């Protein structure tokens, strides 16, 4: 939210606020995040069914063709690798090497079109 980041109201240009606010959208992702942790791939096809996370990890490991014993026998190693990988995400995005440029180009184009509309009036 932080890194992504008028006078046209005189000429009739207006901006309509979104129906769903940022907090409301963020609440939706929280439900999806909570749903996919407590329950595994079942909340999207009916009532949510509880399952321990290591059990869910083992069966998702079984999806790629790896037996369950691999996950259980390496639970600590896998958890540490996963934990460190998540941490690197924040700093990688914080460096902003035009990573969030896909979203910003949408805003830039919208402002460019409005700006050229006002300038055309002269």
């Amino acid at each position: 939210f932080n890194k992504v980041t008028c006078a046209q109201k005189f000429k009739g240009l207006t901006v309509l606020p979104p129906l769903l606010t940022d907090e409301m959208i963020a609440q939706y992702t929280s439900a999806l995040l909570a749903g996919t942790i407590t329950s595994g791939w079942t909340f999207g096809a009916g009532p949510a069914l509880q399952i321990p996370f290591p059990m869910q990890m083992a069966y998702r490991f079984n999806g790629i063709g790896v037996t369950q014993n691999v996950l259980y026998e390496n639970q600590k190693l896998i958890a540490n690798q996963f934990n460190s990988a998540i941490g690197k995400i924040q700093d990688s995005l914080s460096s902003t090497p035009s990573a969030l440029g896909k979203l910003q180009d949408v805003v830039n184009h919208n402002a460019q079109a409005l700006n050229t509309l006002v300038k055309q009036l002269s």
């Binding site: 009739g12 207006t14 509309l117």
Partner: peptide, 17 residues
């Protein structure tokens, strides 16, 4: 990263012209 929605813009035709 995938964009979802764009800015909703409405312009009054009579005032602009």
């Amino acid at each position: 990263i995938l964009p979802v929605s764009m800015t909703k813009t409405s312009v009054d035709c009579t005032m602009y012209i």
